[PDB]
C-alpha cells in the first residue's frame, strides 16, 4: 500500500524544533534533547578515538 500510493509513513518531527518557556509538554521535549545530545557527544567520542582507522579498514 505504501509503494502503490507512493507515500512513506511520517516519523517524529518533534525533537528538532521545540520551544523555550513552553509547558509540561515542552519540559519533556527539552529533557529529551539533553539526554540525546549527551548520547550524541558520547557517540562522536568513540568514533573520533579510532577515527580514520576504522573507516580505512572497511
Amino acid at each position: 500500500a505504501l509503494y502503490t500510493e507512493y507515500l512513506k509513513q511520517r516519523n517524529n518531527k518533534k525533537r528538532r524544533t521545540p520551544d523555550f518557556n513552553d509547558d509540561d509538554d515542552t519540559l519533556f521535549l527539552e529533557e529529551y534533547r539533553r539526554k540525546y545530545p549527551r548520547i550524541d557527544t558520547s557517540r562522536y567520542i568513540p568514533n573520533e578515538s579510532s577515527e580514520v582507522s576504522l573507516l580505512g579498514i572497511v
Binding site: 505504501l2 509503494y3 512513506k8 516519523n11 517524529n12 540525546y36 550524541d40 572497511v58
Partner: protein, 129 residues
C-alpha cells in the same frame, strides 16, 4: 562474502555440508524450520548439519537520524523495490507468452515451407522426364 538468501554481508556466516554455500545463520535457521531442506539444492538438511565459519561498517559522522531519517529510508527502499520487483515479474510472464506464441507461429511457417520447398524441388526432378 555474501549470503545466498537475502543478499546480505553476513555477521555470523554458516556453511551447509550437502551444498557448499554460505548463508547467514538466522536466515538458514529459519528455512530449516519452515521446511527441513537446503534452499538451493533441495537436499535433506538440518540445523545440526550446519557448520559455523569480522566485518566493519564506519557509522557516519552525523550518526535522531537513526530513529527518523535512516530507518525511514530503509523501509522506503524495501517497499518501493519489492513493488517494482513484483512489476518486473509480471512483465516477464507476459513477455514469456509473446515469446512462445511467436515461436509456435514460426514452427508452423517452417512446417508449411518444408512441404512447399521439397515438392518444388521434386517438380524440377520430374520436369526432366
Amino acid at each position: 562474502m555474501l549470503c545466498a538468501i537475502s543478499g546480505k554481508v553476513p555477521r555470523r556466516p554458516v556453511l551447509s555440508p550437502k551444498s557448499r554455500t554460505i548463508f547467514e545463520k538466522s536466515l538458514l535457521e529459519q528455512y530449516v524450520k519452515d521446511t527441513g531442506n537446503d534452499p538451493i539444492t533441495n537436499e535433506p538438511l538440518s540445523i545440526e548439519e550446519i557448520v559455523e565459519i569480522s566485518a566493519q561498517q564506519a557509522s557516519l559522522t552525523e550518526s535522531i537520524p537513526n530513529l527518523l531519517t535512516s530507518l525511514q529510508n530503509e523501509w522506503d527502499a524495501i517497499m518501493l523495490e519489492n513493488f517494482k520487483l513484483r512489476s518486473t515479474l509480471d512483465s516477464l510472464t507476459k513477455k514469456l507468452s509473446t515469446v512462445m506464441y511467436e515461436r509456435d507461429a514460426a514452427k508452423l511457417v517452417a512446417a508449411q515451407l518444408l512441404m512447399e520447398k521439397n515438392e518444388d524441388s521434386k517438380d524440377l526432378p520430374k520436369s526432366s522426364q
